[PDB]
């Protein structure tokens, strides 16, 4: 019956079944999902099976200065039109099939390490094209609610940085995973830390700190050493601009405690100029590749002390048994010093 | 053709701008834009006499791009 | 590329305030914003 037919919107809303108790709580899963297709897309007004040529609708109205008359394509000429439209339909589908793949993160199914691009431009014509965003954790949090039972939300942790010492992180929360990305990356750019770098490639000194139950021990390293650190630390270090560093994470391996613990330790590192100003002495760098040549790295801006720094025969500094055990050749691990890809 | 009171001269310069846009957005744009010599000289003169000197100075490049002889009156103004 | 067609300005802007309106709407016709 003609009067029982419905519009394309009504038919797709029914066939797709996007509203319903299945789609309310995700009670139904979709390995095979009906996909909406626009059937008016490649359709030309005036074109029908019979192949009639209507002047002014599907063919030009005037031909050679005279009005065209009603005509019909030959059986052969119409088969070509039908065949050409079928090929155009596979070509359209083939173009949609050709979608650029994105690189994976720490693993194929992991969100960690994936770039989200630069933060969105702020309302007042502000732009952050120089900043890159990396995901550190994507979690599904489930909240029990008074009337709606278990509800599913997303908590995302992202870090941002420009590669020149300015970097930050922020948590994002939303019901949709892409809204959490927007909130986290946009908020993080307003909570940027500045991280001082020695020669713009490493940290100024060994950093050992604990944040809650997460311990992080970082070691200053020379050029070419690379980033031999927890994969999340590697990601953050590329955003800060650190090229050479060793880090070891102990205790709880909580991504959030690790992230904010790392920024706390990198923001409280004393530079060589600060040490020289604090002690009013020269800071002299001795490099074995340069032999006994003394290289002054920082000199105090104020007066220069005349009294040598006291030489305590033995320093009362606390040592890490892990560092000492390695220097004495007593550290045996099959997992240490393994060959890995450039980081 | 001739100079006019400031009120009229401003009106003639608002039209010359709209005509200039017509030359710039022709549907023969696929073919090289044909900017007659008289049109370029007149459009430039109308901007000067209206006080839109910034627009007139910019147009001088189009005399070299299209290789159109500038008019003596335009150079003196 | 052919320019997209531009809708003309409403002919109400050409109407004089002392016109003969019955000539605009001589017979029953639907409301036309461009004509009223």
């Amino acid at each position: 019956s003609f009067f029982t037919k419905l519009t394309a919107d009504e038919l797709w809303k029914g066939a797709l079944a996007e509203t319903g108790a299945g789609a309310k709580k995700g009670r139904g899963k979709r390995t095979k999902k009906k996909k909406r297709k626009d059937l008016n897309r490649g359709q030309i007004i005036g074109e029908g099976r019979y192949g009639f040529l209507w002047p002014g609708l599907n063919v030009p109205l005037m031909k050679n200065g005279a009005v065209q008359t009603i005509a019909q394509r030959s059986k052969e000429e119409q088969e070509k039109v039908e065949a050409d439209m079928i090929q155009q339909r596979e070509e359209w589908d083939r173009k949609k099939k050709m979608k650029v793949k994105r690189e994976r993160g720490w693993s194929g199914n992991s969100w960690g390490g994936i770039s989200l691009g630069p933060p969105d431009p702020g309302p007042c014509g502000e732009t952050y094209e120089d900043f890159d965003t990396r995901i550190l954790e994507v979690r599904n949090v489930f909240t029990m609610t008074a009337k709606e039972g278990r509800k599913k939300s997303i908590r995302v942790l992202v870090a941002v940085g420009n590669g020149k010492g300015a970097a930050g992180f922020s948590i994002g929360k939303a019901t949709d995973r892409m809204d959490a990305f927007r909130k986290a990356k946009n908020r993080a750019v307003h909570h940027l830390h500045y991280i001082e770098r020695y020669e713009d490639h490493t940290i100024f000194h060994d950093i050992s700190l604990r944040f809650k139950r997460t311990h992080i021990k970082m070691k200053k390293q020379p050029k070419g050493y690379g980033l031999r650190c927890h994969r999340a630390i590697i990601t953050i270090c590329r955003l800060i601009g650190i090229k050479d560093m060793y880090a070891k994470v102990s205790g709880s391996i909580n991504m959030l405690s690790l992230t904010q613990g790392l920024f706390r330790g990198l923001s409280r590192q004393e530079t060589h100029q600060q040490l020289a100003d604090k002690k009013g002495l020269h800071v002299v760098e001795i490099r074995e590749e340069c032999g006994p040549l003394p290289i002054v790295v920082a000199s105090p801006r104020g007066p220069l002390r005349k009294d040598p720094e006291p030489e305590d025969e033995v320093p009362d500094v606390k040592l890490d048994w892990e560092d000492v055990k390695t220097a004495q050749g007593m550290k045996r691990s099959v997992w240490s010093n393994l060959k890995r890809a450039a980081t | 053709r001739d100079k006019h009171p400031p009120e009229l001269q401003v009106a003639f310069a608002d039209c010359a701008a709209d005509i200039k846009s017509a030359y710039e957005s022709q549907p023969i744009r696929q073919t090289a834009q044909d900017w007659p010599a008289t049109s370029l000289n007149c459009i430039a003169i109308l901007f000067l006499r209206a006080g839109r000197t910034q627009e007139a100075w910019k147009m001088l490049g189009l005399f070299r791009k299209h290789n159109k002889i500038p008019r003596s009156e335009l150079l003196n103004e | 590329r052919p320019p997209r067609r531009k809708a003309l300005p409403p002919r109400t802007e050409k109407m004089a305030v002392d016109q003969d309106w019955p000539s605009v709407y001589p017979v029953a016709a639907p409301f036309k914003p461009s004509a009223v």
Binding site: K96, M98, K99, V100, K101, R102, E103, R104, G108, I114 | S25, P27 | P2, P3, R4, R5, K6, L8
Partner: peptide, 16 residues
């Protein structure tokens, strides 16, 4: 997401 997401002027009176 890693597969890819590809959902993918002048006006004239009496145009031609």
């Amino acid at each position: 997401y890693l597969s890819g997401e590809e959902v993918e002027e002048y006006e004239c009176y009496a145009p031609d």
